[PDB]
Write an enzyme that holds these catalytic residues in place. Sequence first.
Site, PDB file in Angstrom:
ATOM      1  N   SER A 127      43.812  36.826  43.170  1.00 61.02           N
ATOM      2  CA  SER A 127      43.006  37.994  43.569  1.00 61.02           C
ATOM      3  C   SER A 127      41.860  37.775  44.596  1.00 61.02           C
ATOM      4  CB  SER A 127      42.490  38.712  42.323  1.00 61.02           C
ATOM      5  OG  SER A 127      43.605  39.341  41.695  1.00 61.02           O
TER       6      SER A 127
ATOM      7  N   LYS B  66      34.084  36.854  44.248  1.00 60.35           N
ATOM      8  CA  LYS B  66      35.349  37.462  43.947  1.00 60.35           C
ATOM      9  C   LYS B  66      36.247  36.412  43.323  1.00 60.35           C
ATOM     10  CE  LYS B  66      38.675  40.305  43.586  1.00 60.35           C
ATOM     11  NZ  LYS B  66      38.828  39.488  42.337  1.00 60.35           N
ATOM     12  N   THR B  67      36.767  36.716  42.136  1.00 58.26           N
ATOM     13  CA  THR B  67      37.612  35.799  41.381  1.00 58.26           C
ATOM     14  C   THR B  67      39.089  35.961  41.706  1.00 58.26           C
ATOM     15  OG1 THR B  67      37.759  37.461  39.675  1.00 58.26           O
ATOM     16  CG2 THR B  67      36.059  35.818  39.417  1.00 58.26           C
ATOM     17  N   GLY B  68      39.856  34.950  41.290  1.00 64.63           N
ATOM     18  CA  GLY B  68      41.309  34.994  41.272  1.00 64.63           C
ATOM     19  C   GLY B  68      41.877  34.214  40.075  1.00 64.63           C
TER      20      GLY B  68
ATOM     21  N   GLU C   6      53.343  39.958  42.001  1.00 69.02           N
ATOM     22  CA  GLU C   6      54.179  38.843  42.432  1.00 69.02           C
ATOM     23  C   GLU C   6      53.357  37.770  43.152  1.00 69.02           C
ATOM     24  OE1 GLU C   6      54.928  42.105  42.891  1.00 69.02           O
ATOM     25  OE2 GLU C   6      56.397  42.218  41.246  1.00 69.02           O
TER      26      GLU C   6
END
Length: 265
Positions: A42, A208-210, A142
Amino acid sequence: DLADRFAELERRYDARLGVYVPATGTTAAIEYRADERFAFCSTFKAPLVAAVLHQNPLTHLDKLITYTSDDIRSISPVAQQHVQTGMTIGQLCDAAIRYSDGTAANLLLADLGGPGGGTAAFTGYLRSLGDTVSRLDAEAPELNRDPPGDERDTTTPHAIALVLQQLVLGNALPPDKRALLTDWMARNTTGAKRIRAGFPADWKVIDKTGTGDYGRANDIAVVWSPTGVPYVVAVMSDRAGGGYDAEPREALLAEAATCVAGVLA
């Protein structure tokens, strides 16, 4: 000896760790596996919002997007509650950043237009900022699921840090659009246990995370010292040795950020 400590973190958490902090007028770059590819997950949502802001007038933020329950994919803490009503472009940006909303991201990608549901255009936006390495190829979810070794949907700590630097601290966006992006990242609700957790409370942190499969956990941030000196921090990690089901370790990101803060102090 910073390298030795990042390596010890990799062993402690059984992970691969990537770190980049760009040089400033008074500090050298910090780099560890900074040129190795890691899945965006993300984190792409932050430059995605920049791309949308950049290609349209501000008045575009009030354009309403309608979608259906079949459009709702992956984690979607926000979009599910506005199916009946739709959401404006501005609300979608807010959701994509502050709640990492995957449907919102997909709708913004579609808003960029073009082949691959907006992914080619998104990669084009990164090229305009001098980032030749990163690429986005699939939409949510995906994009969190490519196998280790696949270059699709990857960036490097080095590349994403220089992108974030231009967006927040540089002139990639005009001041009004820059403030909107900054403000959404400042009020992010998903990164309390990552970079923010590794920095003392009197440093400001926007991020901002992922998060993904194969133990993927990332965070990209701009931080400000207690006297207002800014740095960009990119931390990425994965655990491919554990296969698809490997657990992400947020704590590793927080520890790496503490090592970084100690060097920046």
